[PDB]
Design a binder for this molecule. Structure first.
Ligand code: CLA
Ligand code: CLA
Ligand code: CLA
Ligand code: CLA
Ligand code: CLA
Ligand code: CLA
Ligand code: CLA
Ligand code: CLA
Ligand SMILES: CCCCCCCCCCCCCCCC(=O)OC[C@H](COP(=O)(O)OC[C@@H](O)CO)OC(=O)CCCCCCCCCCCCCCC
Ligand SMILES: CC1=C(C/C=C(\C)CCC[C@H](C)CCC[C@H](C)CCCC(C)C)C(=O)c2ccccc2C1=O
Ligand SMILES: CC1=C(C/C=C(\C)CCC[C@H](C)CCC[C@H](C)CCCC(C)C)C(=O)c2ccccc2C1=O
Lengths: 75, 147, 73, 144, 80, 742, 124
């Protein structure tokens, strides 16, 4: 069980870091169909410590976005 | 369907005194296909055949009746209105141009079923065929075994 | 025994679909947001995305792994 | 500008006919007539299928529904730079001029037109369906 | 007949009128938008409900809305 | 008169990887990059739609021409692989010695995660997957005897593959033909008839006379494959050939002196089958290919190119006009020299029809040695080539419709055949509609009648051979005529073309190769099911073509294009009015029709043809139960599906277990497709909104906005998975059944 | 406008149709139904006699086949009756009227049943 959750979170955490990193570029969508391999490779190696990094974001209040910035439909 | 398949097969093997067949075949899906459906259809599909018929012929007939209604429903679910409305227009043209038949005429202009109506009718055929097919299989496979 | 269990479970299945159907009809025809301001019913609409997305996660997990285990066997 | 009067004597484009034309509805309910002036003989596509040749000068065709007349109007206007008009003709002989309604095509704003079916609010400002319940029939909150 | 309504978010771009295959809509003078024109729906007895007008509308949310109603020979698009 | 000549442009397109790194470059809409996931799907759907990227006909033609070299390159790689796997991963050499008792095999799986069970004991001291493509029987017919010969062909295939890919690059980037080059239809037909087909047949006849016949003559005499002279020894030593065929002692003089009767020893008209191998006499095929070569070389001199003589195809068409059809064939030459879609519509229709003919003619007149008694190969080849034909025919409907929307022009088609067909399309479709209803009632209704009478215990009231009879007397009469042809109407033929007409069976290795096929009531009923299903498929496809541009429902459908989802919920609802949607519905009906065709073939051959031959007689695989059972739906469900699925559902733990897995996998893919066919994107887009909210909440929302599939893609996905699952199900069912009892 | 063909517009075809009782105006609607009834009643007995459930019985076949055909004539007459009730509620040819169609339907029943009876007499 814990073997899977470590690898699964590794994949998820690395992908999330890449997504956030490229959203500061001039054309974010171009970095999603043409992968920035040098950037992707660096993030892959640093994902071995995701359980520590994820907790710090959770404790720092930066893991989640605020409700005022999330679009929703009328209710 | 999953719930009742489960209930039925577990009781068929209990009623036959061999729970091991369920315990060993239910862990993979070929087991359900081979040992539940295929194996227990034998008496049902022989209700009538070239050599005669027996009291399971009604269930054999209903079994195929269920498959037919089920499949007819696929027509309404897959093909949608615009195709049929165009088709009916050629039939409207043909009727008015046919001698001895254009003397008769409709009071309601024929049209294809509506978009919503097709979904309901198609679901109705799907559902009725679903129910009848299983009912025939359930009764025939149980009573034939224990009747 | 087989006919009775199958008969009532299918009827239960249809009845449950109707219950949710008329729950959806209620929200359109009868629900009044002003007269339910801030109560539990109006708050269900406030986190409908959370409810739907978690139902989606549960269904995905069960589907992937139940089908996966059957196929593995 | 004044409403034109239909001239039934107008010649029609050269066309051998088809099975896609008028039906019993024209005899009993209504049909449509489109007319236009052609600068030269030219081949155009019939909305009911096939090719026809428009005669130089006045032309006249008859169609079974309004959309067919306007479909040919769009073709003539955009591909040949013509100015057609069409009518609704009832079995008892009455003629109702239809298009362009006031002599100016609708896409061009014209003076003297009175707005219809205009709500002075956004879509998001419609009331809930519960407020129009039991109004005598089925009606949307957009109908108030 | 179907019900067609124009809302005050219209920018008077005329695209709904150009897209209507039945000539249901037209442009009338207005003062609420920069173009000084608003879409109008004078002839809704001919609307077939295709919603090409809604497809053409650029505003968000729509400024022209079709609500499908009772069916007649015209609204059904029958030629028979 | 324009001279037929070579004309190209030098260096039209620079060879560079710049555009490889710019996805969507070919289209003005997509070249700006994605904003939503729909862009990704659109990139692939439009990639080969060349005419939607430009209006220049020359630019389109050049892309077509080089795309074709690409296709040929891929086919050569595929062929090279088959020959290579025959050279390195097969039991072909062992099979050549004992063809009846060894199963062909040319695929070997690695031992990993227990999958090596799939390497079955196929004989010849070899383990592997049993192939049903028939390559072993093809290779023996051509005279191949060693793995070295197979290996050399594989190398040559790669050299050809490289040459094809070079030609594609060369003729697009370096020397691209001009539009006038492509429009030399007279010259193209002369070369493709006289050159491609005529010389190709002559050359192959040359191989048969000098290699296939001598080698197969010695193989059928019991000579060991390694003691047979190598093919070049036969070529260089006339004495060796003269021993096998004495006429070779006279050289080529009899051919030049018109003493052609001298070659009767290797150019024959035997007919029937070789009793040793169960296939056609190779001396008959060699004479066939010689005669074909002459016919096509004559045909290749019909059209005028540069020397006055020959026919103008335009002049032929314009001359054939009659009282009933207006201007007739005027304008067709212009259409067929300016529209690729028009050309593709005709070529796909006949190429697909040709494929179905190949399926029938190869089962009835098996052209390869030891093909007839390899029941697994016979069933596979017939099924395979039937499906290709069906798919190709549907593509003909699709591209006829595309021509109708994009390339058709009224100014060039006034009162000609094309114009006049459009002007009575309601008459055409209305009558075809009636025929389908008549055929549906009086063909499928007969089965329903039979099922009901049988269930009610009134077998005497059924349509059957022992009851009310429906004899296909016309088909029975034709069979008798063909069986008696050698006596009167084909005096120089020793035997009839096929044993299916009548006569005596041919047994090879204790099994029936071919034998007469009797046609009773069950055969009458199933043939009118075939007539019904074909007519409906035509109805759907023809309607889509004739109403592609307009209808009484949508007067301006042409402006909406070939492929669009609908024109809105108005007019009562107009879902699936477009021509593309008719191809979509036509695919289902094509699948329904050809499923019954192959079920007809499978059950009839097992019941009445295939079987073992012993002293007591012929015992068929299913014991001749087709005649009395195939006249009820319950008969097909019980005696065919339920009974013959025993092999596939019992294959777990054996070398055939892979077919058991695919059998279930294909059922899954089929059912998975119903999710796309029954639902609509509006539901899925709203579902994706909630899932996007969760990704937004965690700052993991993608920059390319997720979108549900377009309406049209939802249909394309649905039918693609429906067909793949349905066909792959029957594929597993057939192979597991026939490889086990065959 | 419309597509004219030899089938649609021919002299031999047009003359034949005008001779049929359906298109023969100036004849009482009741007489029209009788002539149409007789023609259809006579042919209807055929398939029932030769292909019914009692076809193989020596003498019962003729009675059962014709008796079943008579039942189908009654059903057809009822269909004509209700059609007139629906179609004509609110002109040149009296047949296309509420009173005319009712008379026409009545004639079809009498003619149809007589035609079935006459067919039975021919068999035996
Ligand atoms: C106490 C039970 C109950 C009651 C009082 C109602 C009442 C109502 N429902 Mg609800 N509903 C129920 C249960 C109930 N429902 C259940 C169990 C379900 C789930 C199946 C639903 C699902 C549902 C939906 C989805 C909708 C309603 C709607 C309605 C309204 C209109 C019904 C109508 O006109 O039907 C007319 C009924 C018919 C024309 C007949 C339908 C026949 C079906 C398809 C089965 C046919 C079987 C076939 C003939 C079998 C042949 C067998 C063969 C061998 C011969 C009404 C207020 C509708 C509405 O607008 O509500 C506001 C609506 O859209 N209901
Ligand atoms: C057997 C048929 C079938 C299958 C397998 C599914 C599967 C699914 N449906 Mg669907 N559905 C079906 C029929 C089916 N449906 C039908 C007939 C209808 C009626 C129209 C619907 C209507 C419907 C609705 C309305 C909804 C679903 C939903 C779902 C999801 C449920 C959760 C789940 O299982 O997640 C796990 C996923 C799966 C089991 C899907 C299969 C995954 C495979 C095994 C992956 C294999 C990958 C592998 C590498 C091979 C790739 C090869 C390829 C690259 C060539 C899932 C994607 C719900 C959903 O989206 O929930 C989130 C949902 O809202 N379905
Ligand atoms: C239609 C073309 C085709 C196909 C589908 C295959 C398929 C296969 N080949 Mg073959 N092959 C082909 C053409 C083809 N080959 C050609 C043209 C050649 C000559 C260059 C070869 C030479 C070749 C060799 C030398 C071998 C195969 C092997 C294989 C198998 C394993 C491949 C693998 O997993 O690689 C690994 C995947 C990647 C590197 C990615 C597989 C069944 C292997 C085999 O049969 O093993 C027992 C093997 O050793 N092939
Ligand atoms: C190395 C040589 C080379 C280079 C650098 C180029 C470069 C170019 N070519 Mg040229 N071309 C070449 C070789 C080359 N070509 C060859 C060998 C052929 C013959 C087939 C052609 C035929 C050709 C045509 C007809 C066209 C071009 C075009 C182009 C341009 C866009 C290419 C593009 O987007 O490719 C990216 C595309 C791909 C990577 C797809 C590759 C497809 C090939 C056939 C392999 C597919 C095999 C695969 C296994 C299929 C099954 C998949 C399945 C297993 C999943 C660009 C200037 C296009 C253009 O716009 O020119 C102005 C154009 O229309 N080329
Ligand atoms: C006798 C001459 C000849 C021959 C043999 C061919 C053969 C072929 N042509 Mg045709 N063609 C010819 C003359 C010829 N053509 C002329 C004169 C014109 C101009 C009017 C055309 C214009 C033309 C077009 C526009 C197209 C073809 C295509 C084809 C291919 C169709 C697919 C097929 O059957 O593959 C069977 C395959 C084989 C038998 C393999 C044969 C390979 C060798 C190298 C011979 C190829 C023929 C070539 C002319 C040889 C010299 C080339 C060069 C070095 C001088 C086929 C290879 C289609 C194609 O796929 O093109 C790529 C295609 O699109 N041809
Ligand atoms: C395309 C098909 C084809 C081909 C290639 C051949 C080829 C051959 N046949 Mg066959 N044959 C065929 C069809 C074919 N046949 C058909 C259809 C029939 C039935 C009518 C026959 C019936 C038949 C018979 C009955 C016989 C042959 C024979 C032969 C061989 C000798 C022919 C001969 O005398 O040529 C005469 C001369 C030429 C063909 C001209 C050769 C020109 C050379 C290549 C020119 C090279 C010039 C160049 C500059 C050199 C450069 C050198 C370099 C090192 C610098 C030869 C291998 C004979 C044989 O011995 O078979 C074993 C024989 O007896 N054939
Ligand atoms: C000689 C054959 C031939 C040729 C050259 C073409 C060429 C063309 N066709 Mg046509 N077509 C053909 C046969 C052919 N067609 C047949 C047989 C059919 C019937 C099925 C059709 C039906 C058809 C339609 C309905 C349409 C076309 C269209 C097109 C155009 C665009 C194609 C494209 O971009 O594909 C891009 C390719 C893909 C997106 C890949 C598709 C892969 C399929 C869906 C699944 C393959 C599964 C695989 C075989 C097995 C499973 C693998 C998996 C497990 C990994 C192009 C002009 C389109 C158009 O608009 O033309 C103007 C169009 O809409 N064709
Ligand atoms: C088993 C399923 C099924 C059935 C029965 C049908 C039936 C039909 N389809 Mg459909 N279709 C289906 C599935 C089915 N389809 C699916 C899945 C799709 C989606 C791909 C389509 C898509 C489709 C298209 C696109 C078209 C058809 C067409 C047709 C018609 C063909 C003409 C015909 O044979 O009429 C006769 C009817 C039958 C043979 C059905 C059985 C008739 C029974 C045996 C008669 C019983 C009589 C008895 C007195 C009943 C009394 C009952 C009670 C009142 C007492 C017919 C109505 C074509 C059409 O309309 O052609 C004109 C057509 O264009 N279908
Ligand atoms: C049979 C019809 C022959 C028809 C035949 O021989 O036609 C031949 C007849 C000859 O016309 P022309 O002499 O003017 O032909 C000149 C040609 O060069 C074509 O332009 O053509 C027509 O009448 C065209 C339209 C026929 C429309 C026929 C409608 C009925 C179709 C029935 C289909 C049955 C299919 C059965 C398949 C087994
Ligand atoms: C087949 C089909 C048609 C054509 C079908 C039509 C026009 C219906 C024809 C029905 C005839 C009259 C037979 C009716 C038989 C029923 C058993 C009658 C039941 C009546 C109840 C009152 C009991 C559509 O109009 C359609 C529309 C939208 C999506 C899909 C489809 C669709 O699939
Ligand atoms: C299920 C379904 C969907 C939902 C299906 C969708 C959105 C397609 C999903 C495709 C893939 C799985 C998503 C994208 C995958 C990416 C390429 C990333 C892959 C990552 C791996 C390589 C790890 C529709 O959008 C739809 C639309 C119209 C009619 C019916 C339906 C329908 O039935």
């Amino acid at each position: 069980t814990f073997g899977f959750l470590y690898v699964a979170g590794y994949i998820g955490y690395v992908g999330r870091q890449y997504l956030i990193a490229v959203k500061g570029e001039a054309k974010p969508t171009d970095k999603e169909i043409i992968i920035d391999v040098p950037l992707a490779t660096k993030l892959a190696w640093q994902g071995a410590g995701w359980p520590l990094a994820a907790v710090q974001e959770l404790q720092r209040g930066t893991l989640l976005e605020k409700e005022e910035n999330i679009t929703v439909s009328p209710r | 369907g999953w719930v009742t398949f489960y209930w039925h097969w577990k009781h068929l093997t209990l009623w036959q005194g061999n729970v091991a067949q369920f315990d060993e075949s239910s862990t993979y899906l070929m087991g359900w296909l081979r040992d539940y459906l295929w194996l227990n259809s034998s008496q049902l599909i022989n209700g009538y055949n070239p050599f005669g018929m027996n009291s399971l012929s009604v269930w054999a007939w209903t079994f195929l009746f269920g498959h037919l209604i089920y499949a007819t429903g696929f027509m309404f679910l897959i093909s949608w209105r615009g195709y049929w409305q165009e088709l009916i227009e050629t039939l409207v043209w043909a009727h008015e141009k046919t001698p001895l038949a254009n003397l008769v005429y409709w009071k309601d202009k024929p049209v294809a079923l509506s978009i919503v109506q097709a979904r309901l009718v198609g679901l109705a055929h799907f559902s009725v065929g679903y129910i009848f097919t299983y009912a025939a299989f359930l009764i025939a496979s149980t009573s034939g075994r224990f009747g | 025994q087989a006919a009775l269990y199958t008969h009532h479970q299918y009827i239960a299945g249809f009845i449950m679909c109707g219950a949710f159907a008329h729950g959806a009809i209620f929200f359109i025809r009868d629900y009044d947001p002003e007269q339910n301001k801030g109560n539990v019913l109006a708050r269900m609409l406030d986190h409908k995305e959370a409810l739907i997305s978690h139902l989606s996660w549960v269904s995905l997990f069960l589907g992937f792994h139940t089908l996966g285990l059957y196929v593995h066997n | 500008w004044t409403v034109p009067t239909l001239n039934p004597d107008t010649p029609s484009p050269i066309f051998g006919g088809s099975t896609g034309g008028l039906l019993r509805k024209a005899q009993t309910e209504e049909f449509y007539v489109i007319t236009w002036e052609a600068k030269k003989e030219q081949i155009f596509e019939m909305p009911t299928g096939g090719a026809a040749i428009m005669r130089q000068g006045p032309n006249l065709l008859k169609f079974g529904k309004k959309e067919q007349c306007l479909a040919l109007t769009t073709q003539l206007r955009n591909k040949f730079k013509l100015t057609p008009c069409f009518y609704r003709v009832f079995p008892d002989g009455k003629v109702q001029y239809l298009h362009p309604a006031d002599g100016v095509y609708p896409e061009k704003v014209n003076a003297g037109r009175v707005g219809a079916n205009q709500n002075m609010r956004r879509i998001g400002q419609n009331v809930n369906p519960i407020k129009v319940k039991f109004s005598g029939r089925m009606m949307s909150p957009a109908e108030i | 007949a179907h019900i067609v309504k124009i809302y005050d978010t219209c920018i008077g771009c005329t695209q709904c009128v150009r897209a209507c295959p039945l000539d249901v809509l037209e442009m009338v003078p207005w003062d609420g938008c920069k173009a000084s024109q608003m879409a109008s729906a004078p002839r809704t007895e001919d609307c077939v409900g295709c919603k090409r007008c809604e497809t053409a509308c650029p505003t968000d949310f729509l400024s022209v809305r079709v609500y499908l109603g009772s069916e007649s020979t015209r609204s059904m698009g029958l030629s028979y | 008169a324009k001279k037929v000549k070579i004309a190209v442009d030098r260096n039209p397109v620079e060879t560079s990887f710049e555009k490889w790194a710019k996805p969507g470059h070919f289209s003005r809409t997509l070249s700006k990059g994605p904003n939503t996931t729909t862009w990704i799907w659109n990139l692939h759907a439009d990639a080969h739609d060349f005419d939607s990227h430009t209006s220049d006909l020359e630019e389109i033609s050049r892309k077509v021409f080089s795309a074709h070299f690409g296709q040929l390159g891929i086919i050569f790689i595929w062929l090279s692989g088959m020959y290579f796997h025959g050279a390195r991963f097969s039991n072909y050499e062992a099979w050549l010695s004992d063809p009846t008792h060894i199963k062909p095999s040319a695929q070997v799986v690695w031992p990993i995660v227990g999958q090596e069970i799939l390497n079955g004991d196929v004989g010849g001291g070899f383990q592997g997957i049993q192939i049903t493509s028939g390559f072993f029987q093809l290779w023996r017919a051509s005279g191949i005897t060693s793995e070295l010969q197979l290996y050399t062909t594989a190398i040559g295939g790669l050299v050809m593959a490289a040459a094809m890919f070079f030609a594609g690059w060369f003729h697009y980037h370096k020397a691209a033909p001009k539009l006038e080059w492509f429009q030399n239809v007279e010259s193209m037909l002369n070369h493709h008839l006289g050159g491609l087909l005529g010389l190709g047949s002559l050359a192959w006849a040359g191989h048969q006379i000098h290699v296939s016949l001598p080698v197969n003559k010695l193989l059928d005499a019991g000579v060991d494959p390694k003691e047979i002279p190598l093919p070049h020894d036969l070529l260089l030593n006339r004495a060796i050939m003269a021993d096998l065929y004495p006429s070779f002692a006279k050289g080529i003089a009899p051919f030049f002196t018109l003493n052609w009767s001298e070659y009767s020893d290797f150019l024959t008209f035997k007919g029937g089958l070789n009793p040793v191998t169960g296939g056609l006499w190779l001396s008959d095929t060699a004479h066939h290919h010689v005669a074909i070569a002459v016919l096509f070389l004559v045909a290749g001199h019909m059209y005028r190119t540069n020397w006055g003589i020959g026919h103008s195809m335009k002049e032929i068409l314009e001359a054939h006009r009659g009282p009933f059809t207006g201007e007739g064939h005027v304008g067709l030459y212009e259409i067929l020299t300016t529209s690729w879609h028009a050309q593709l519509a005709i070529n796909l229709a006949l190429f697909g029809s040709l494929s179905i003919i190949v399926a029938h003619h190869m089962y009835a007149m098996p052209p390869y040695p030891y093909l007839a008694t390899d029941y697994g190969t016979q069933l596979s080849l017939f099924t395979h080539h039937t499906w290709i034909g069906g798919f190709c025919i549907v593509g003909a409907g699709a591209h006829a419709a595309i021509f109708m929307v994009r390339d058709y022009d009224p100014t060039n088609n006034y009162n000609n055949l094309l114009d006049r067909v459009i002007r009575h399309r309601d008459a055409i479709i209305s009558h075809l509609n009636w025929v389908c209803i008549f055929l549906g009632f009086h063909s499928f209704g007969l089965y329903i009648h039979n099922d009901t009478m049988s269930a009610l215990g009134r077998p005497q009231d059924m349509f059957s051979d022992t009851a009310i009879q429906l004899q296909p007397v016309f088909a029975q009469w034709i069979q008798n005529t063909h069986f008696l042809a050698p006596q009167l109407t084909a005096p120089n033929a020793l035997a009839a073309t096929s044993l299916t007409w009548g006569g005596d069976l041919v047994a090879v290795g204790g099994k029936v190769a071919m034998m007469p096929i009797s046609l009773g009531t069950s055969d009458f009923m199933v043939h009118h099911i075939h007539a019904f299903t074909i007519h409906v498929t035509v109805l759907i496809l023809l309607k889509g073509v004739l109403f592609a541009r307009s209808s009484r429902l949508i007067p301006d459908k042409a402006n909406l294009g070939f492929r669009f989802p609908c024109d809105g919920p108005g007019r009562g609802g107009t879902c699936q009015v477009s021509a593309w949607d008719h191809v979509f519905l036509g695919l289902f009906w094509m699948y329904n029709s050809l499923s019954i065709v192959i079920f007809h073939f499978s059950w009839k051959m097992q019941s009445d043809v295939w079987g073992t031959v012993t002293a007591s007689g012929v015992s068929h695989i299913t014991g001749g139960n087709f005649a009395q059972s195939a006249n009820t739906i319950n008969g097909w469900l019980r005696d065919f599906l339920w009974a013959q699925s025993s092999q596939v559902i019992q294959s777990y733990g054996s070398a055939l277990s892979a077919y058991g897995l695919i059998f279930l996998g294909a059922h899954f893919v089929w059912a998975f497709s119903l999710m796309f066919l029954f639902s609509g994107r509006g539901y899925w887009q709203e579902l994706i909104e909630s899932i996007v909210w969760a990704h937004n909440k965690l700052k993991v929302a993608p920059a390319i906005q997720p979108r549900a599939l377009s309406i049209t893609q939802g249909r394309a996905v649905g039918v693609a998975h429906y067909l793949l699952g349905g066909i792959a199900t029957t594929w597993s069912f057939f192979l597991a059944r026939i490889i086990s009892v065959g | 406008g419309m597509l004219e063909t030899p089938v649609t517009s021919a002299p031999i075809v047009a003359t034949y149709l005008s001779n049929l009782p359906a298109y023969r105006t100036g004849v009482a609607p009741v007489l029209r139904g009788v002539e149409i009834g007789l023609a259809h009643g006579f042919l209807l007995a055929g398939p029932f006699i030769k292909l019914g459930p009692l076809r193989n019985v020596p003498e019962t076949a003729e009675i059962a086949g014709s008796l079943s055909a008579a039942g189908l004539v009654l059903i057809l007459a009822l269909c004509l009756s209700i059609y007139g009730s629906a179609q004509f509620q609110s002109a040149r040819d009296p047949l296309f009227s509420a009173d005319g169609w009712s008379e026409f339907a009545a004639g079809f029943l009498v003619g149809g049943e007589a035609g079935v009876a006459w067919a039975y007499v021919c068999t035996q």
